[PDB]
């Protein structure tokens, strides 16, 4: 292609301008390029200034290539094929330019075009790059491999595909040849390329796997960081997918990776340390580690010290050698449990009590990291560590304060199982103080720590409730976005832990206004809602009637959020390319607040359901393909069925069928909530339930008889069957023979409450009506009856009837035959209570 001597002048004036000091001189020239962009012939000039025009300067030539690259990103589909084909050929001729800046620029064009433009449209690119790897000119080799690395990273899944006739079958073995090159730059590219295809179990690579391993081993000595980095990466990925082939060499690998975890370079060490985190997940960790464990624990622990750059950032960092080391230690502690303690105690002994805060801080981290795994072993030292930790809560250094909050929170359960004045109370007091610490990290650590403590403490918090509220309320005005979300968790957890004790006027007059304020500031798009509504759901359940003044605005918005979300779903479904699918977490959260509100308010919710389409929406929610949505909606169904059934009764005919299909233990929770819901429905239908029982009974029975089914599900099924039989014994009783065993085995164990009552009534009814059912397993029923400490009188009297009924009708000393295989309490419980 031929540039014009006058067009050229113009572009060089731009390039030279865009390469400038003044801010406002750049804003105008920026928008001057935005004009020229869509004119294809612009790109012809850009690539011309780069690849030709050597008389022109290097910074300007590079920028020309880099601007073109941004065009490629922005507007490449519209490039005409002759411009494109010009660029591609021009790049490839200069991929090994003598100048590093030029070379790099050309490189990134190549890789950008290869991803944006897509590989099938440059079908010679790979064999061409692969051919240039053998170039005698070093810089050409490097350049090709620079591109190849980036392409492998950007497009691995395409390469390992039918799309390009499966080129990894030559490429991978070619790459391995390059592990033995004399340039570390090229060795590194070679390994980086091959690593892109380990997790994907690329067949070319699997075939060559023992040659990959041998070749990686030969880079064990290598003393260049980027090669070490990639050998470590490789070994870590191999452990994940082909441990079978590593095993022969496992000892030598572990030796190597332990060296690299101690590496001088934090980036290499981070990649090595990942090996211990993967290895800990595998069931031969103990065997593999036996000869190195002793040294690994100190190496990990030492890696847990803050780097210097970590510290300054923290006065949102992310994943690093400290974090990785700590994660490794936490997992190892769950593997080795108390066997780890003797390795750790010598190190903790010299870190906890140390004058340099960075060292001490790391020791407190260790103490938290191993808490889960090593609890039993740790108990004897807690009486001294805990008060020590509480002292450190008021340490001068902020980062010591924050890690202290967390570590203390990791031993909450023990703290709470002791006398409350010994540890719990002082810990509370010091954590509360730190909730308003001047440092943000400490604020989040303390608020979170306190939330974890609240969960363990439950009713023990009730006496410090006014202290707790005054502090958390103030944090509402203090805390900014990140700790606010944690505050909401703390509040909601408070509410779940102290329930109705929260329902006091002064506590409400301080709490609800700031909550609502935060409600109203937020937008329905804002994910900060999730923690806020989970929070209110919890509060509402706990304030019950207290919440009335605050409910209507909240109720409506929740129902509208579900509405909104179901709408975006429909939209995305219709125009997928034009509307983004919705985040169904908004619907789940809203549905769960409405349950919390149905539960809190009972019948006081009725006036609201009466002005709502919530049942209409629930009908779509119950049919959503995401379990967690169905789960939430069946919960809400139960709740409204209890609170205000007059509004639910019209929908039962359409609901019951769907409840039918969802009695599927593929999804435990969906199934549990459906089951529960059905049961509560029955209590409201009464006899009118008769038409609907066939839809559910068989699978209720299937579930109650199914092995390895969680107990809370079994209980619910037992109770639901019970409730069906109570209102419709005729339909239910016949299958009694098939359910009475696990029904009895399940409800034996639950407390004397209203659910139990309901279910037992229903079983009593079904017995009269089909005694052939209990007879064979009638002891189970007796046992079940003896589960009751004080039955309501009328149920006691049904127990009499059935028992006398069986005692009389069988024979007044066949009873005594049968009675003598009852255990003692049972026998006597029956004798004194039922005259039997």
């Amino acid at each position: 292609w031929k540039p014009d001597e006058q067009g050229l002048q113009q572009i060089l004036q731009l390039l030279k301008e865009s390469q400038s000091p003044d801010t406002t001189i750049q804003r105008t020239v920026q928008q001057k390029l935005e004009q020229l962009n869509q004119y294809p012939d612009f790109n012809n000039y850009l690539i011309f200034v780069l690849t030709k025009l050597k008389s022109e300067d290097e910074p300007t030539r590079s920028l020309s290539g880099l601007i073109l690259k941004n065009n490629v990103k922005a507007h490449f589909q519209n490039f005409p094929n002759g411009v494109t084909d010009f660029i591609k050929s021009e790049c490839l001729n200069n991929i090994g330019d003598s100048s590093p800046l030029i070379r790099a620029t050309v490189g990134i064009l190549i890789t950008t075009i290869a991803s944006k433009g897509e590989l099938q449209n440059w079908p010679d690119l790979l064999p061409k790059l692969c051919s240039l790897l053998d170039s005698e000119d070093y810089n050409t080799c490097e350049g090709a491999f620079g591109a190849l690395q980036k392409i492998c990273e950007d497009s691995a899944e395409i390469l390992d595909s039918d799309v390009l006739d499966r080129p990894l079958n030559i490429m991978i073995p070619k790459f391995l040849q390059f592990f033995k090159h004399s340039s570390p730059k090229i060795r590194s590219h070679a390994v980086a390329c091959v690593n892109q295809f380990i997790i994907s179990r690329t067949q070319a690579l699997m075939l060559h796997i023992d040659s990959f391993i041998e070749n990686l081993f030969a880079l064990a000595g290598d003393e260049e960081p980027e090669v070490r980095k990639n050998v470590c990466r490789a070994l870590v990925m191999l452990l994940e997918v082909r441990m079978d082939r590593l095993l022969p060499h496992m000892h030598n690998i572990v030796e190597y990776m332990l060296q690299r975890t101690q590496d001088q370079d934090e980036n290499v060490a981070l990649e090595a340390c990942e090996f211990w985190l993967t290895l800990a997940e595998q069931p031969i960790c103990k065997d593999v580690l036996v000869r190195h464990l002793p040294k690994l624990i100190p190496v990990l622990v030492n890696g847990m010290k803050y780097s210097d750059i970590d510290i300054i950032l923290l006065k949102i960092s992310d994943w690093n050698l400290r974090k990785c080391s700590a994660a490794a230690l936490d997992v190892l502690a769950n593997v080795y449990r108390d066997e780890l303690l003797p390795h750790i105690l010598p190190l903790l002994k010299e870190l906890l009590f140390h004058h340099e805060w960075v060292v001490k801080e790391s020791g407190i981290l260790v103490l938290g990291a191993i808490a889960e795994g090593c609890m039993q072993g740790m108990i004897p030292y807690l009486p001294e560590l805990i008060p020590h930790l509480i002292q450190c809560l008021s340490d001068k250094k902020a980062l010591v304060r924050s890690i202290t909050c967390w570590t203390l929170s990791r031993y909450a359960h023990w703290v709470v199982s002791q006398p409350p004045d010994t540890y719990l109370k002082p810990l509370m007091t010091e954590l509360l103080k730190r909730i308003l610490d001047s440092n943000k990290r400490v604020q989040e650590a303390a608020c979170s720590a306190f939330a974890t403590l609240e969960e363990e403490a439950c009713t023990e918090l009730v006496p410090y409730l006014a202290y707790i509220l005054d502090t958390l309320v103030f944090a509402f005005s203090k805390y900014q976005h990140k700790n606010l979300l944690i505050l909401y968790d703390a509040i909601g957890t408070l509410a779940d832990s102290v329930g109705h004790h929260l329902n006091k006027p002064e506590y409400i007059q301080m709490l609800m206004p700031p909550l609502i304020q935060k409600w109203n500031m937020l937008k329905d798009e804002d994910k900060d809602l999730f923690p806020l509504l989970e929070c209110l759901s919890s509060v509402a359940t706990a304030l019950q009637s207290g919440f009335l003044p605050y409910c209507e605005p909240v109720y409506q918005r929740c129902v509208n959020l579900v509405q909104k979300t179901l709408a975006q779903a429909m939209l995305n479904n219709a125009q997928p390319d034009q509307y983004e699918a919705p985040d169904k977490d908004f619907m789940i959260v809203a549905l769960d607040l409405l349950s919390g509100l149905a539960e809190g308010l009972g019948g006081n919710i009725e006036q609201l359901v009466a002005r709502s389409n919530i049942l209409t929406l629930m009908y779509q929610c119950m049919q959503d393909k995401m379990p967690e949505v169905r789960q939430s909606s069946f919960a809400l169904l139960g709740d409204l069925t209890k609170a205000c059934f007059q509004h639910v009764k019209p929908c039962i005919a359409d609901f019951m069928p769907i409840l039918g299909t969802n009695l599927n233990p593929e999804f435990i929770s969906v199934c549990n909530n459906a089951t529960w819901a059905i049961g509560e429905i029955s209590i409201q239908m009464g006899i009118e339930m008769q038409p609907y029982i066939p839809m559910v009974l068989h699978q209720l029975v299937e579930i109650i008889n199914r092995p390895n089914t969680p107990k809370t599900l079994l209980e619910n099924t037992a109770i639901t069957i019970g409730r069906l039989g109570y209102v419709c014994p005729q339909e239910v009783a016949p299958m009694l023979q098939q359910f009475i065993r696990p029904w009895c085995t399940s409800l034996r164990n639950i407390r004397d409450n209203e659910e139990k009552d309901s279910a037992f009534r229903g079983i009593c009814t079904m017995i009269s009506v089909n005694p052939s059912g209990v007879i064979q397993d009638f002891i189970f029923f007796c046992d079940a009856v003896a589960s009751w400490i004080n039955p309501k009188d009328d149920l006691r009297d049904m127990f009499c009837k059935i028992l006398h009924g069986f005692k009389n009708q069988v024979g007044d000393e066949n009873w005594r035959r049968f009675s003598d295989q009852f255990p003692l309490p049972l026998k006597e419980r029956l004798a004194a209570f039922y005259g039997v």
Binding site: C447, L485, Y488
Partner: peptide, 8 residues
């Protein structure tokens, strides 16, 4: 879902 705080 990132409302529980953790050093790792």
């Amino acid at each position: 879902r990132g409302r529980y705080r953790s050093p790792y």
